[PDB]
């Protein structure tokens, strides 16, 4: 019935070139086992799209990982919004849905524009510089935390925290397990600023805990709710900007392009999350016995989801090796899709459009001039160090 694979997605020579990989999974059928894991996969649009929007057969209250919830103790306390199903999840998604609302972003839009231009201007005087640490890193550390209202010391915990949360989702490989070996600083600080006196008033921080009057969440679920802006809110959108500026640096044509119209700066970004899929995995967990694509899935079984193949699903996408700004990208499973679909999406969305609007304006050309040294995550697909050299328009 079902297709046996030895594949395992979540090793070094899958991070380092999944393409392939990625079309034997989507090909061998709509849903395949991967023995190393013991757990069903499906790398077509079709499933992918389908499991997302199930959320009473596909839950995610087991875990969003490969530890099922049931069985083992998870690494930390739950998320009340990513691992929870409806209707536990409501409530909580309704509130953080409200912190970053579309009335949200208009109080920090040109905080967080003004932010991007004085940061391409900035590296536009150092010529050669890294677009991962001095671009896709350094700016959204120059805007997130402080519309989160961290305070300014241990902020350096903040990146190391967000790896390690997405590495944890991954199997109880090297990887997960050195990052769990190394959180006991990280989930400490994350877990004091968490609290409202340490929250700054108008932040991110400071309006969860806010919420709390209303009945939606109780004061001893605020906490937890921003746990999760800083354990999701960071490093996807670092290595969605620096896909970005990667695909511009491989696709000069379409730096051209974004130059000639720099209102495409918002679809350049949501091409570049299609095109390179800074998630690219996780799982659900059948709760009931079900059919999906003419394979019987038992219950109680992990379904594992390739965002960044049903990203690239042929069978879907026009060309989808191909990065064009002006696809229409409607659709896409970047940011999910159903319930769970990134409830900071808009935050993220400005933040890559500021930034590519940006250096639209400001930038004539991006050249690699370094090795490309490529970051590994179980979760995380993205660069640890993209060498540039930026010419000024
Ligand atoms: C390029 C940037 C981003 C990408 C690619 C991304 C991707 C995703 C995806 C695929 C999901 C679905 C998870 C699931 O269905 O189990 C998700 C959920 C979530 N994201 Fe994002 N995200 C990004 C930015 C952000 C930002 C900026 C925030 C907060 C400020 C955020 C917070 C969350 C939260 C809290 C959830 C859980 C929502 C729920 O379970 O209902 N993410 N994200
Ligand atoms: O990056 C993600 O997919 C993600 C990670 C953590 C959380 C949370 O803490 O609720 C939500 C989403
Ligand atoms: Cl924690």
């Not at 389908?50 to 990982?65: E, K």
């Not at 120059?142 to 915990?157: I, N, T, W």
């Amino acid at each position: 019935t079902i297709p046996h694979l030895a594949i395992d997605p979540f090793s070094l020579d899958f991070f380092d070139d999944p393409y392939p990989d990625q079309q034997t999974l989507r090909d061998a059928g709509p849903v395949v086992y991967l023995d190393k894991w013991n757990v069903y996969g499906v790398a077509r649009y079709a499933e992918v799209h389908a499991v997302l929007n199930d959320p009473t057969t596909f839950c995610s209250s087991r875990g969003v990982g490969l530890s099922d919830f049931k069985k083992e103790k998870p690494w930390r306390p739950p998320s009340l919004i990513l691992e929870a199903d409806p209707p536990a999840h409501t409530r909580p998604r309704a509130v953080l849905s409200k912190v970053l609302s579309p009335a949200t972003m208009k109080t920090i839009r040109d905080g967080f524009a003004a932010a991007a231009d004085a940061k391409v201007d900035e590296l536009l005087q150092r010529g050669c510089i890294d677009a991962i640490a001095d671009l896709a890193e350094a700016y959204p550390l120059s805007v997130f935390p402080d519309a989160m209202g961290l305070k300014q010391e241990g902020r350096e915990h903040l990146l190391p925290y967000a790896g390690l949360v997405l590495n944890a989702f991954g199997p109880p490989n090297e990887l997960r397990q050195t990052a769990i070996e190394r959180s006991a600083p990280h989930q400490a600080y994350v877990n004091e600023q968490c609290q409202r006196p340490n929250l700054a008033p108008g932040g991110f921080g400071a309006c969860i805990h806010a919420f709390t009057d209303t009945g939606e969440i109780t004061p001893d679920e605020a906490p937890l709710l921003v746990r999760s802006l800083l354990s999701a809110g960071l490093d996807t959108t670092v290595n969605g900007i620096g896909a970005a500026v990667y695909c511009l640096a491989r696709f000069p044509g379409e730096l051209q392009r974004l130059r000639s119209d720099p209102t495409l700066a918002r679809n350049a970004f949501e091409e570049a999350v299609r095109f390179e899929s800074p998630v690219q995995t996780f799982f659900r967990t059948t709760t009931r016995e079900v059919e999906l694509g003419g394979a019987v899935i038992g219950e109680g079984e992990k379904v594992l989801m390739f965002l960044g193949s049903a990203n690239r699903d042929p069978r879907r996408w026009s060309d989808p090796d191909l990065y064009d700004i002006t696809r229409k990208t409607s659709g896409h499973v970047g940011f999910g899709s159903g319930v769970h679909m990134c409830v900071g999406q808009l935050v993220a969305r400005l933040e890559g459009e500021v930034m590519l609007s940006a250096l639209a304006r400001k930038v004539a050309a991006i050249d690699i001039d370094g090795p490309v040294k490529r970051r590994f995550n179980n979760t995380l697909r993205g660069l640890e160090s993209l060498p540039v050299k930026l010419t000024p328009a």
